[PDB]
Nucleic acid binder design. Structure first.
Length: 101
RNA sequence: GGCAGAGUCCUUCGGGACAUUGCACCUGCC
């Protein structure tokens, strides 16, 4: 395939298991991604489109670049999964730039 | 303030049938 591949603040992971809880999927993303840097927050949805994926916000855009080079296609919930950068930024960073100026 | 969806619809929100390897940061009842 031909993925544009672009750097962003939040990364989107897909191809996950379809039987994870909300406190269990958010606790695993904060333990691995935090090892690289400090995480701000993690959101997980269980809708049809979101039936196996999550989003993590890194303190800086560089913190997500390293989390993808080492976690590119790694095991998360008893299964292999590839990570692709997110398409847009996170709404929490909208005010982190400086109380929305 | 309880609770689910965040996938569609009947709807008194009480319950109920049926689909999805797919870029989200959100609403409603009382």
């Amino acid at each position: 395939a031909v993925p544009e591949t672009r750097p962003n603040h939040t990364i989107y992971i897909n191809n996950l298991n379809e039987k994870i809880k909300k406190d269990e999927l958010k606790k695993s993303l904060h333990a691995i991604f935090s090892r690289f840097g400090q995480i701000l927050d993690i959101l997980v949805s269980r809708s049809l489109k979101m039936r196996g994926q999550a989003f993590v916000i890194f303190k800086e855009v560089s913190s997500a670049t390293n989390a993808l080079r080492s976690m590119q296609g790694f095991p998360f919930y008893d299964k292999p999964m590839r990570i692709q950068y997110a398409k847009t930024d996170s709404d929490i960073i909208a005010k982190m730039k400086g109380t929305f100026v």
